[PDB]
Design a protein around this ligand. Sequence first.
Ligand SMILES: *[C@@H]1O[C@H](CO[C@@H]2O[C@@H](C)[C@@H](O)[C@@H](O)[C@@H]2O)[C@@H](O[C@@H]2O[C@H](CO)[C@@H](O[C@@H]3O[C@H](CO[C@H]4O[C@H](CO)[C@@H](O)[C@H](O)[C@@H]4O)[C@@H](O)[C@H](O[C@H]4O[C@H](CO)[C@@H](O)[C@H](O)[C@@H]4O)[C@@H]3O)[C@H](O)[C@H]2NC(C)=O)[C@H](O)[C@H]1NC(C)=O
Ligand SMILES: *[C@@H]1O[C@H](CO)[C@@H](O[C@@H]2O[C@H](CO)[C@@H](O[C@@H]3O[C@H](CO[C@H]4O[C@H](CO)[C@@H](O)[C@H](O)[C@@H]4O)[C@@H](O)[C@H](O[C@H]4O[C@H](CO)[C@@H](O)[C@H](O)[C@@H]4O)[C@@H]3O)[C@H](O)[C@H]2NC(C)=O)[C@H](O)[C@H]1NC(C)=O
Ligand SMILES: *[C@@H]1O[C@H](CO)[C@@H](O[C@@H]2O[C@H](CO)[C@@H](O[C@@H]3O[C@H](CO[C@H]4O[C@H](CO)[C@@H](O)[C@H](O)[C@@H]4O)[C@@H](O)[C@H](O[C@H]4O[C@H](CO)[C@@H](O)[C@H](O)[C@@H]4O)[C@@H]3O)[C@H](O)[C@H]2NC(C)=O)[C@H](O)[C@H]1NC(C)=O
Ligand SMILES: *[C@@H]1O[C@H](CO)[C@@H](O[C@@H]2O[C@H](CO)[C@@H](O[C@@H]3O[C@H](CO[C@H]4O[C@H](CO)[C@@H](O)[C@H](O)[C@@H]4O)[C@@H](O)[C@H](O[C@H]4O[C@H](CO)[C@@H](O)[C@H](O)[C@@H]4O)[C@@H]3O)[C@H](O)[C@H]2NC(C)=O)[C@H](O)[C@H]1NC(C)=O
Ligand SMILES: *[C@@H]1O[C@H](CO)[C@@H](O[C@@H]2O[C@H](CO)[C@@H](O[C@@H]3O[C@H](CO[C@H]4O[C@H](CO)[C@@H](O)[C@H](O)[C@@H]4O)[C@@H](O)[C@H](O[C@H]4O[C@H](CO)[C@@H](O)[C@H](O)[C@@H]4O)[C@@H]3O)[C@H](O)[C@H]2NC(C)=O)[C@H](O)[C@H]1NC(C)=O
Ligand SMILES: *[C@@H]1O[C@H](CO)[C@@H](O[C@@H]2O[C@H](CO)[C@@H](O[C@@H]3O[C@H](CO[C@H]4O[C@H](CO)[C@@H](O)[C@H](O)[C@@H]4O)[C@@H](O)[C@H](O[C@H]4O[C@H](CO)[C@@H](O)[C@H](O)[C@@H]4O)[C@@H]3O)[C@H](O)[C@H]2NC(C)=O)[C@H](O)[C@H]1NC(C)=O
Ligand SMILES: *[C@@H]1O[C@H](CO[C@@H]2O[C@@H](C)[C@@H](O)[C@@H](O)[C@@H]2O)[C@@H](O[C@@H]2O[C@H](CO)[C@@H](O[C@@H]3O[C@H](CO)[C@@H](O)[C@H](O)[C@@H]3O)[C@H](O)[C@H]2NC(C)=O)[C@H](O)[C@H]1NC(C)=O
Ligand SMILES: *[C@@H]1O[C@H](CO)[C@@H](O[C@@H]2O[C@H](CO)[C@@H](O[C@@H]3O[C@H](CO)[C@@H](O)[C@H](O)[C@@H]3O)[C@H](O)[C@H]2NC(C)=O)[C@H](O)[C@H]1NC(C)=O
Ligand SMILES: *[C@@H]1O[C@H](CO)[C@@H](O[C@@H]2O[C@H](CO)[C@@H](O[C@@H]3O[C@H](CO)[C@@H](O)[C@H](O)[C@@H]3O)[C@H](O)[C@H]2NC(C)=O)[C@H](O)[C@H]1NC(C)=O
Ligand SMILES: *[C@@H]1O[C@H](CO)[C@@H](O[C@@H]2O[C@H](CO)[C@@H](O[C@@H]3O[C@H](CO)[C@@H](O)[C@H](O)[C@@H]3O)[C@H](O)[C@H]2NC(C)=O)[C@H](O)[C@H]1NC(C)=O
Ligand SMILES: *[C@@H]1O[C@H](CO[C@@H]2O[C@@H](C)[C@@H](O)[C@@H](O)[C@@H]2O)[C@@H](O)[C@H](O)[C@H]1NC(C)=O
Ligand SMILES: *[C@@H]1O[C@H](CO)[C@@H](O)[C@H](O)[C@H]1NC(C)=O
Ligand SMILES: *[C@@H]1O[C@H](CO)[C@@H](O)[C@H](O)[C@H]1NC(C)=O
Ligand SMILES: *[C@@H]1O[C@H](CO)[C@@H](O)[C@H](O)[C@H]1NC(C)=O
Lengths: 317, 248, 99, 49, 198, 198, 50
Amino acid sequence: NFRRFFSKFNVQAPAVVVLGGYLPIGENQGVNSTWYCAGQHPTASGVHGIFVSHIRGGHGFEIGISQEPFDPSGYQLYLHKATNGNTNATARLRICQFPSIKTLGPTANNDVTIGRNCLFNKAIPAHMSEHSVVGITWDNDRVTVFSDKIYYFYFKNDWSRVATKCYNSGGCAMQYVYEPTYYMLNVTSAGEDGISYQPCTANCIGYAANVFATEPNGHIPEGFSFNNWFLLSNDSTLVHGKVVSNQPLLVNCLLAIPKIYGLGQFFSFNQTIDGVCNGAAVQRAPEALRFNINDTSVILAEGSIVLHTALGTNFSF
Amino acid sequence: VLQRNQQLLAESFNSAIGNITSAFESVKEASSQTSRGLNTVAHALTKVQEVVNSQGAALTQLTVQLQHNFQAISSSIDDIYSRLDILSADVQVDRLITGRLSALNAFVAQTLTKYTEVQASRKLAQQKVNECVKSQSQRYGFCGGDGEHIFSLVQAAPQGLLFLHTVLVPSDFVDVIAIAGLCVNDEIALTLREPGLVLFTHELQNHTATEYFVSSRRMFEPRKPTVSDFVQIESCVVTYVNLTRDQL
Amino acid sequence: VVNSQGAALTQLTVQLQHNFQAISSSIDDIYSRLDILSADVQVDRLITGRLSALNAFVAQTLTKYTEVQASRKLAQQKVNECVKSQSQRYGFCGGDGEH
Amino acid sequence: VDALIEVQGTAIQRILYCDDPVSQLKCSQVAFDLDDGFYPFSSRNLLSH
Amino acid sequence: TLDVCTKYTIYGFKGEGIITLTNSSFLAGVYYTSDSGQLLAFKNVTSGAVYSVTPCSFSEQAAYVDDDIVGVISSLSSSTFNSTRELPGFFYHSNDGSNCTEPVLVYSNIGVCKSGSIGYVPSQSGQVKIAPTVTGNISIPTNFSMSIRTEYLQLYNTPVSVDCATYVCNGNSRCKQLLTQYTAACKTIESALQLSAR
Amino acid sequence: RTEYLQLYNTPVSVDCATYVCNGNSRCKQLLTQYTAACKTIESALQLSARLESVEVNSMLTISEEALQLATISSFNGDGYNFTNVLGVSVYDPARGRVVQKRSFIEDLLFNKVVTNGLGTVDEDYKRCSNGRSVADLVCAQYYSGVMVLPGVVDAEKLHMYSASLIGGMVLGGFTAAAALPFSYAVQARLNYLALQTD
Amino acid sequence: QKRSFIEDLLFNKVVTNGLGTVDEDYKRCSNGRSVADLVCAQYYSGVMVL
Ligand SMILES: *[C@@H]1O[C@H](CO[C@@H]2O[C@@H](C)[C@@H](O)[C@@H](O)[C@@H]2O)[C@@H](O[C@@H]2O[C@H](CO)[C@@H](O[C@@H]3O[C@H](CO[C@H]4O[C@H](CO)[C@@H](O)[C@H](O)[C@@H]4O)[C@@H](O)[C@H](O[C@H]4O[C@H](CO)[C@@H](O)[C@H](O)[C@@H]4O)[C@@H]3O)[C@H](O)[C@H]2NC(C)=O)[C@H](O)[C@H]1NC(C)=O
Ligand SMILES: *[C@@H]1O[C@H](CO)[C@@H](O[C@@H]2O[C@H](CO)[C@@H](O[C@@H]3O[C@H](CO[C@H]4O[C@H](CO)[C@@H](O)[C@H](O)[C@@H]4O)[C@@H](O)[C@H](O[C@H]4O[C@H](CO)[C@@H](O)[C@H](O)[C@@H]4O)[C@@H]3O)[C@H](O)[C@H]2NC(C)=O)[C@H](O)[C@H]1NC(C)=O
Ligand SMILES: *[C@@H]1O[C@H](CO)[C@@H](O[C@@H]2O[C@H](CO)[C@@H](O[C@@H]3O[C@H](CO[C@H]4O[C@H](CO)[C@@H](O)[C@H](O)[C@@H]4O)[C@@H](O)[C@H](O[C@H]4O[C@H](CO)[C@@H](O)[C@H](O)[C@@H]4O)[C@@H]3O)[C@H](O)[C@H]2NC(C)=O)[C@H](O)[C@H]1NC(C)=O
Ligand SMILES: *[C@@H]1O[C@H](CO)[C@@H](O[C@@H]2O[C@H](CO)[C@@H](O[C@@H]3O[C@H](CO[C@H]4O[C@H](CO)[C@@H](O)[C@H](O)[C@@H]4O)[C@@H](O)[C@H](O[C@H]4O[C@H](CO)[C@@H](O)[C@H](O)[C@@H]4O)[C@@H]3O)[C@H](O)[C@H]2NC(C)=O)[C@H](O)[C@H]1NC(C)=O
Ligand SMILES: *[C@@H]1O[C@H](CO)[C@@H](O[C@@H]2O[C@H](CO)[C@@H](O[C@@H]3O[C@H](CO[C@H]4O[C@H](CO)[C@@H](O)[C@H](O)[C@@H]4O)[C@@H](O)[C@H](O[C@H]4O[C@H](CO)[C@@H](O)[C@H](O)[C@@H]4O)[C@@H]3O)[C@H](O)[C@H]2NC(C)=O)[C@H](O)[C@H]1NC(C)=O
Ligand SMILES: *[C@@H]1O[C@H](CO)[C@@H](O[C@@H]2O[C@H](CO)[C@@H](O[C@@H]3O[C@H](CO[C@H]4O[C@H](CO)[C@@H](O)[C@H](O)[C@@H]4O)[C@@H](O)[C@H](O[C@H]4O[C@H](CO)[C@@H](O)[C@H](O)[C@@H]4O)[C@@H]3O)[C@H](O)[C@H]2NC(C)=O)[C@H](O)[C@H]1NC(C)=O
Ligand SMILES: *[C@@H]1O[C@H](CO[C@@H]2O[C@@H](C)[C@@H](O)[C@@H](O)[C@@H]2O)[C@@H](O[C@@H]2O[C@H](CO)[C@@H](O[C@@H]3O[C@H](CO)[C@@H](O)[C@H](O)[C@@H]3O)[C@H](O)[C@H]2NC(C)=O)[C@H](O)[C@H]1NC(C)=O
Ligand SMILES: *[C@@H]1O[C@H](CO)[C@@H](O[C@@H]2O[C@H](CO)[C@@H](O[C@@H]3O[C@H](CO)[C@@H](O)[C@H](O)[C@@H]3O)[C@H](O)[C@H]2NC(C)=O)[C@H](O)[C@H]1NC(C)=O
Ligand SMILES: *[C@@H]1O[C@H](CO)[C@@H](O[C@@H]2O[C@H](CO)[C@@H](O[C@@H]3O[C@H](CO)[C@@H](O)[C@H](O)[C@@H]3O)[C@H](O)[C@H]2NC(C)=O)[C@H](O)[C@H]1NC(C)=O
Ligand SMILES: *[C@@H]1O[C@H](CO)[C@@H](O[C@@H]2O[C@H](CO)[C@@H](O[C@@H]3O[C@H](CO)[C@@H](O)[C@H](O)[C@@H]3O)[C@H](O)[C@H]2NC(C)=O)[C@H](O)[C@H]1NC(C)=O
Ligand SMILES: *[C@@H]1O[C@H](CO[C@@H]2O[C@@H](C)[C@@H](O)[C@@H](O)[C@@H]2O)[C@@H](O)[C@H](O)[C@H]1NC(C)=O
Ligand SMILES: *[C@@H]1O[C@H](CO)[C@@H](O)[C@H](O)[C@H]1NC(C)=O
Ligand SMILES: *[C@@H]1O[C@H](CO)[C@@H](O)[C@H](O)[C@H]1NC(C)=O
Ligand SMILES: *[C@@H]1O[C@H](CO)[C@@H](O)[C@H](O)[C@H]1NC(C)=O
């Protein structure tokens, strides 16, 4: 079940990463409250993530997501999926402020705040399997779709009320999740099957926030926060804006949670750095080295940092 | 005066309102050039878009020039002021003040140039409302073009005013027989007076039924004529149909 | 006017020939002479000059285009009144006579 | 390497590269989505060093 | 080296390009340049060999479609695309060599459909007007309908004001007394903007 | 009486980077600091071309019926000549259909004042793309990174445009059997302006 | 009496509140008290659109 759910995402063979999110637990594991919005300690916020792959009629899937606090100047979403087959599973997805009503149809006054044309209007193919669900989750400005490939999109608004013009399904037919659970995902089999999807207990946030997969092209996988990543600037400061520039972001190798540097580990700009290059491997001599920080006390206590010049002069931190 | 024909045009107006209302939002759904040419919302939104982008300009570059240091140690006058004696900095500040003043003279000239041209343009649009709206134009296509005007709903938009020309549209064409003129007793030439109207004969003499009416050339409103509606001439040409006094 | 339009592009290469305070306009060759620092100074000079020239270019070109859009607005006006039709405005097109 | 950067309120996200004539123009236009139409481009001739 | 892209180093004129032979003839002169100052064609003495060089780079016009490029316009037949059709004045490059029927992007008398096919756009049918007639026959219009046409115009522009001194003097005192030498430009702008605003 | 007015203007196309950089990797990465101005100018020129293009397309109209009556044979000659002004009907070219060239009068003014070999006869850039011989400034300025957009319309299009518009005034009913005599419409206008008696 | 249907719809679609069109209060710049965007700055530059 979960094997097919997470096998769709593509990644290099030697990978182990902690993943957090509203993962499914039961077909109809009922909610513990009757709330659809999110606030302090937001757990029973309704359906943070819904996942459905079954239907009792088979005619199709109509989905409408909005926010009950009624901010009509925002955006709405409809999904019209033709429940026929796999290529026919292509669903018309429309992210636009919709001329909709709180009632799921034209039977009252309409919300017409649709000044903007649209934010998205395309048809996305899907597929059918018993253990391949299609669903949607939202988390802050993050929107993630389990349908074929993950679909992640960024926008600033609130979405709190979910409904469907097609309710011809049982409670177990759709899985609604509301609590972001954490699981460490390990894959090294070089196949659709990962090593495990074991739940994560500790260091999950750090591991998730720092561990990623090195691409064959050395590019950045999406969704990464870059929480401790900052623009390389020799001066000045920019709160906001956009720019193109040269930055030390290409990668030759990747390491995480080191355990050997305490034994006088040495690194050079010539040699490609050895170790578990988490993700792909690049046979390119390093040009710079980036370091994550958790507790400087180790550095303060026994961090022995000494640098060497082309004339042999050294400087010890 | 059937009272229905204007009703028939009414749902045409209402159906047109629906498309116009529809076309206001999401122009790029199934747009066509025939629906994107002149007198189209797309052309209209093109105009509104370019003008709003146009007005959203001509100020940033001003910040750009003042940012620069031109042929001087530093853009901070006080720095050199604190870091140097008087005379050399005086040379550079003269350069600097000359640079800023020259840039803004070019700027103020071009801005007033827009001002002059828009004064003329603003004048022109002023008439447009007067005639087309405040009054009824007899021009063929002056308000917009190639149509017969009915009225126009005039509205506004940020810092401007807009026209929507409600215009009648021809769809059918009545094919009728025209008469050159009348002569009677080879003495009296019965002839037209007002060029807009025209005499004619619906149907022909196939079964002794020649329906002599008069109507406007432009519009099809057949009706029986009157003698006083015509004029008399003392000269005749072959173009006139021959009639007798009994036929008068 | 056709002689007029047969102009306003020759001058471009002229200042492109001209060197804005530098040893030589050949950016590649001068780049192939010394270190990077001084060359960076001069290349900024030339790019600024040429961009400013084309900024000028843009202003008068759009100026011609602005004045001419009004012009053929009037022209399309003309093709309406007494061209596709006949009006009673005396001498409106033509002048000094009855059309 | 070279890429486009988006910073918002001292936060950084949506960083895109330029290793594509399509992408080069995209960062040459600093827009994630461009507008369909004609755009002139040179001949990319970095084939041989 | 001949007719290849190479690093030319010629009489203090250096660079990269492709040289070509030409058969021109002039009893004098050895080099010939462009308006910009670059040298295209030249001759050598002992043999009169005349050569013209070309850059190893040229431009082209490519069309952005939906979210990709499907059509390219260049001067060389070779292209990465399946098909390249030599249209009058240019080469059209695409993998879709079909006929355009419902053009989506139109330039001049030419247009391109969604699939990328290109075509010649026929002239749009114009409105029909019936001239008056002396006699005989006429097609009088009847049975009319509605059509509403669009028009806009922007009327007024917001004014702006600046103090040159403040804009140029950020609090200094010595500045104004030094700059007393010339100020009339500030005068011209202020009066002009004020009268314009009023 | 005589009047004239010009209609549109020739557009220009330039690439900023190429115009400034003649194939310079270091320079382009250097100039990467400032580019927004290039975006503005290209947008302006591109958006312009589009806006004037669509409006001229809206300006033009067509009427094949007027084309039917265009020829002298398709006009009921009444004393008047209209010989050198009426457009010439030319044979079937490689197209295979009878097409129309320009009448005597405009060809006269063209061949006198409009110099052949200028920018009006659009140049196919292939000739210098192969090069192989000494060329003129146009390919060099292409080398500079400049290309001149083809004319949006054609003289023949305007020729038959003007022909259709002028010939539209002889129509009677829909597809009239024979053109009404020009004189007949004349006294029509004459009576309109002032009803004639004699 | 507020706006009719179309103009307010076109107003909101083409112009968003907080653009150059919307009016501004100059008191906060005098107070400061927070980060400043351009608008106070060009006031500091001495330019003023009426
Ligand atoms: C460690 O670095 C080595 C060099 O890198 C620098 O030095 C070290 C100390 C660090 O500071 C580092 O940061 C520096 O950047 C690196 O060596 C690599 O591999 C070989 C080493 O032998 C070298 O490549 C050679 O290339 C030539 C061709 O280049 C020109 O050579 C002559 C120069 O005049 C010209 O005439 C030619 O036309 C070429 O244009 C090859 O000919 C040569 O083949 C043989 O060279 C030696 C000669 O004794 C033999 O012993 C070898 O076995 C070869 O068979 C090499 O191919 C070069 O130093 C460097 N090349 C590259 C591409 O990196 C070494 O790999 C680094 N080690 C690690 C583990 O990272
Ligand atoms: C993510 O998923 C991967 C895939 O399973 C896990 O990798 C396994 O890790 C365990 C724990 O170390 C391995 O088990 C031990 O492996 C030792 C090393 O040999 C393996 O590794 C080398 C190099 O990768 C391979 O070439 C080799 O073929 C082996 O696969 C063995 O030496 C160990 O056996 C020793 O101890 C036993 C007693 O316990 C003795 O009987 C033996 O004789 C020997 O002395 C042991 O087998 C396992 O092998 C790894 N898998 C693979 C395929 O190598 C990751 O740990 C996992 N990570 C997370 C976070 O989930
Ligand atoms: C803030 O301010 C600093 C200070 O200037 C800027 O730092 C510059 O960064 C750039 C980017 O790398 C540097 O450019 C590089 O210069 C190298 C100089 O090496 C020569 O000089 C040394 C002596 O100093 C010699 O010993 C050596 O042998 C060389 O002769 C170049 O080697 C680099 O080459 C690049 O291009 C080649 C292709 O030709 C590539 O193969 C290389 O990998 C490399 O990419 C490069 O040109 C520049 O030198 C730095 N300045 C100084 C003074 O050193 C920051 O960029 C600036 N901005 C920010 C945001 O920090
Ligand atoms: C200008 O307007 C007048 C007034 O409407 C028109 O007079 C109408 O003429 C049309 C035909 O041109 C008639 O429309 C059709 O009438 C059918 C029955 O009426 C006569 O039909 C034939 C005519 O060929 C006679 O032989 C027969 O004996 C009938 O007496 C209706 O059944 C038709 O309805 C269907 O078609 C229309 C159009 O497709 C659809 O919208 C309908 O839903 C339906 O499917 C059709 O209405 C009409 O009867 C005439 N009206 C009157 C009052 O006589 C002029 O003809 C018109 N000028 C034109 C068209 O040039
Ligand atoms: C609009 O202006 C026209 C011209 O001033 C007025 O006169 C009409 O003119 C057209 C053409 O000029 C006429 O169309 C004609 O159709 C006729 C059809 O033949 C009739 O007569 C024969 C012999 O009696 C019958 O057997 C037959 O059934 C028909 O009743 C012919 O006269 C013409 O076509 C004939 O000759 C040609 C060439 O030889 C052949 O190719 C044909 O096959 C056919 O044999 C001609 O096409 C039209 O009929 C004229 N009007 C009338 C009322 O007759 C119009 O009157 C004017 N319109 C109005 C409304 O006033
Ligand atoms: C041009 O250059 C490239 C390589 O250099 C090649 O071009 C490709 O050529 C192949 C085969 O000629 C083309 O393949 C075609 O794909 C079409 C698209 O269908 C897609 O979707 C269906 C599901 O609806 C999938 O089953 C299918 O695999 C595709 O993913 C198909 O429609 C084509 O035929 C199929 O569909 C038709 C109609 O449905 C059926 O009647 C057929 O039986 C068949 O099932 C065909 O499979 C491919 O699109 C080309 N790519 C391009 C042009 O970019 C060629 O070597 C070269 N020349 C040509 C002419 O392309
Ligand atoms: C569109 O598809 C046509 C198919 O060929 C033919 O097109 C029409 C002319 C019809 O006759 C069709 O029944 C027939 O299959 C492709 O062929 C070319 O079409 C053009 C369009 O008119 C033909 O026109 C020629 O134009 C030149 C210059 O105007 C004249 O000299 C010719 O005498 C002729 O009029 C042409 O003959 C025809 N064949 C060729 C060019 O070999 C056409 O390529 C295709 N278009 C596109 C853009 O894909
Ligand atoms: C003139 O235009 C107004 C504005 O649209 C029309 O009023 C509209 O009338 C329709 C038809 O009744 C209303 O539609 C309603 O839709 C809801 C579902 O959204 C449905 O439940 C209702 O039964 C009704 O059909 C619409 O709300 C209403 N809008 C407004 C603003 O009044 C009016 O009808 C038009 N004039 C004529 C003569 O139709
Ligand atoms: C209606 O009355 C007028 C008034 O007389 C008639 O006009 C006359 O018509 C005859 C017959 O066509 C004309 O005779 C013609 O003379 C010319 C030479 O002028 C000759 O070439 C012809 O063969 C014919 O014989 C006569 O001139 C003319 N006179 C006038 C003053 O118009 C008209 O004919 C009458 N209508 C009908 C249908 O007969
Ligand atoms: C309609 O216009 C045509 C075109 O002009 C007239 O036909 C041609 O007219 C020209 C001058 O009008 C004649 O040129 C002659 O050339 C000879 C030799 O150079 C010269 O000696 C004469 O003095 C005259 O300039 C030409 O012969 C003549 N050709 C023909 C075939 O007509 C035509 O006469 C005009 N018709 C009407 C009704 O206006
Ligand atoms: C080059 O030679 C031309 C003579 O005819 C050409 O001969 C060779 C070179 C081939 O190109 C062949 O296709 C031609 O028939 C001269 O007409 C031409 O002027 C010469 N080039 C120059 C620059 O003078
Ligand atoms: C795809 O599904 C739609 C709606 O379910 C249906 O109308 C269409 O015929 C289907 N197409 C195929 C090829 O099955
Ligand atoms: C001084 O730093 C050491 C090394 O990090 C740390 O262990 C120690 O606690 C510090 N000194 C005191 C008195 O805490
Ligand atoms: C728009 O016009 C079409 C005819 O072109 C008509 O069928 C349709 O009903 C109209 N739309 C509305 C909303 O009335």
